[PDB]
Design a protein around this ligand. Structure first.
Ligand SMILES: CCCCCCCC/C=C\CCCCCCCC(=O)O[C@H](COC(=O)CCCCCCCCCCCCCCC)COP(=O)(O)OC[C@@H](O)CO
Ligand SMILES: CC(C)CCC[C@@H](C)[C@H]1CC[C@H]2[C@@H]3CC=C4C[C@@H](O)CC[C@]4(C)[C@H]3CC[C@]12C
Ligand SMILES: CCCCCCCCCCCCCCCC(=O)O
Ligand SMILES: [Cl-]
Lengths: 33, 193, 51
């Protein structure tokens, strides 16, 4: 097997970024008086 | 204004609960999956090892990954640092599942009180996860990890081995736990308004 | 603590909370089954699918 970690790392950081984007969206919505 | 305010608060609360379940799933996945650190091109042997379970290779043009390690048997764990990291991750999982239970208290108890209770327990779970991820690096100096990776590997020294998706997923879990806990703190304060 | 309160008042719950102990049974009636269901779910999925 090709011992390379590109696709797995990419999808991992993509999902992490999506979750954090939703969380900061919630935070900004709360702090938008 | 009041109806919009109440609807927004309810929607954000439901979203916070959904992401809390997601964080619990992430905690379970990182604890169960043994893919914290793994081999590289230059590693003497292939393999991958998590908090307690490790599957090093055989070393003859082959797969031959020998999965030994179980948290239920502390002897099989290579290092006391590994034991402590597994214990802290387990405590964080216990706390977050404690909140998946305490969501039931919203029926009767005060909304601000329940929100604060999980805001504090989510903060504690994030602290435990930070402690676990900070103490897990100390265990690479053990003989098994040294044989797995190489002589360059040491305390807070990867050497040639590479962090796989579970470690970075743990870091995302830590920072998401922190932001979720702060969201919970402010939500609980916002219920009283 | 940007709202302008003390750290403890912002964080903790030193306002009423103990007093509401009579409702412990009412809390438990739904708390304990939820905890057991969660434990069963995580235990079985870990030992069957992910383990
Ligand atoms: C796979 C994992 C499965 C885990 C299972 C998770 C489920 C765990 C079990 C039960 C949850 C029960 C939730 C009940 C929520 C109902 C909340 C409710 O009754 O409405 C009001 C709003 O509350 C609120 O905004 C708080 C919002 C509740 C948020 C928590 C519930 C999350 C449910 C999302 C589930 C999605 C699952 C999908 C996963 C893929 C509060 O009432 P109330 O004003 O009269 O009180 C004021 C006081 O004076 C007297 O109670
Ligand atoms: C009471 C509520 C709030 C929390 C319940 C926590 C449960 C889900 C925890 C507590 C102890 C945990 C177990 C501890 C040890 C192991 C061995 C490991 O090799 C696989 C996971 C497994 C099997 C865990 C699964 C989840 C578990 C059963
Ligand atoms: C097991 C159930 C443990 C219940 C712990 C107390 C829950 C909240 C008590 C009510 C406090 C309040 O007045 O808001
Ligand atoms: Cl185990």
């Amino acid at each position: 097997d090709s011992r390379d970690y590109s696709t797995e790392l990419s999808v991992t950081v993509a999902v992490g970024a999506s979750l954090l984007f939703l969380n900061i969206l919630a935070f900004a919505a709360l702090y938008y008086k | 204004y009041h109806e919009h305010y109440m609807r927004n608060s309810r929607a954000i609360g439901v979203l916070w609960a959904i992401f809390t379940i997601c964080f619990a799933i992430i905690n379970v996945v990182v604890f169960i999956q043994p893919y914290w650190v793994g081999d590289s091109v230059s590693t003497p042997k292939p393999g991958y090892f998590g908090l307690f379970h490790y599957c090093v290779g055989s070393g003859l043009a082959g797969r031959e990954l020998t999965c030994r390690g179980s948290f239920t048997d502390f002897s099989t764990i290579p290092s006391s640092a590994f034991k402590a990291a597994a214990f802290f991750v387990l405590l964080s999982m216990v706390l977050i599942l404690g909140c998946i239970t305490c969501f039931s208290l919203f029926f009767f108890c005060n909304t601000a009180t329940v929100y604060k209770i999980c805001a504090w327990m989510q903060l504690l779970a994030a602290l435990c996860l930070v402690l676990g991820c900070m103490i897990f690096p100390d265990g690479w100096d053990a003989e098994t990890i040294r044989d797995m990776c190489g002589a360059k590997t040491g305390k807070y020294s990867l050497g040639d081995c590479s962090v796989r998706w579970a470690y970075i997923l743990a870091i995302i879990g830590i920072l998401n736990a922190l932001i979720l806990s702060f969201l919970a703190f402010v939500l609980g304060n916002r219920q009283t308004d | 603590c940007l709202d302008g309160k003390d750290c403890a008042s912002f964080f903790c719950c030193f306002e009423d909370c103990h007093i509401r102990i009579a409702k412990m049974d009412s809390y438990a009636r739904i708390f304990f089954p939820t905890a057991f269901c969660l434990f069963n779910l995580v235990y079985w999925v870990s030992y069957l699918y992910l383990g």
